[PDB]
Symmetry: D3
Subunit: 64 residues, 6 copies
């Protein structure tokens, strides 16, 4: 399967790889797709390019 992830910019390389590995496991385990068939694609955009219910999303920083 193809899993496309349009996420906000600002995560580390390690966070994005952790996401891709967790999604790969999740897909394999829940729908029985072989790992060899799984293709995860990550695309980053600014928060302003995510407009949900008419409102832009804030920039991600991980500050909390």
């Amino acid at each position: 399967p193809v899993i496309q992830c349009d996420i906000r910019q600002g995560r580390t390389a390690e966070q994005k790889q952790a996401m891709a590995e967790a999604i790969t496991r999740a897909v394999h385990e829940t729908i029985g797709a072989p790992v060899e068939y799984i293709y995860v694609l990550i695309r980053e955009t600014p928060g302003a390019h995510h407009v949900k219910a008419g409102r832009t999303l804030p920039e991600y920083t991980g500050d909390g």
Copy 2:
């Protein structure tokens, strides 16, 4: 974030919901996206519509 999942047809409603929930948790935990921001979208296609490295994928049946 938007997570699009192009998977082969033939899974049960329970399998697809399990996948969507597991992806939601995976994205939340690895990149810190609030659950409220996550949108998972599932599309089903025949196996013949997945052509990886020049080869058609088989149909998913749940059997093996």
Copy 3:
């Protein structure tokens, strides 16, 4: 530009055409894309294939 619209199944042909025309006008008027460059693509899915903030969306019926 390409505008992909993943919507829930159940709308009439007239509703979907109205949406495509309104999006075409909206894109033309707000960002100055010539109408000739605009391509709107509509895909329908069951409500269960839309999982937002962990929750499945209901089926669209036209009633309420």
Copy 4:
């Protein structure tokens, strides 16, 4: 619903937000999707990455 907008780079932040708000209204009004379900995603690319009928599209500047 998910509305993905692959547009050419070069618009202002205000033009892109106007587009996302107009698309949100257009979708809500034509197919009856609640605003809370609507997720607009904007991606920018160079004109050379839009190849329509075999021809690349020019860069957008808004000059006219």
Copy 5:
């Protein structure tokens, strides 16, 4: 790479496989992507779901 092909319904299984193979060869030969990395995904929609320059596309029948 991922190559998504949103085409109008009505083609034979042989036509769609021919398209996927020809795209695989085209991508391999022009940008040097190894065949092993290429994933082609085909989705079919009614002609009415393709609205280009404000106009609906006709249904594909194989006749003319």
Copy 6:
């Protein structure tokens, strides 16, 4: 039809245009879509954003 090409960064403008023209011909010839209906969209990402079978893809350089 819409053909979306998510490829790794690092190709020349000429390689990407050759790809788009070859895909346009391939689609026209195999499924009979008129060239005027064909819209190819190219998006570039780092190799680390392509995670296939759990493994990131290397950066493309064309060195061989």
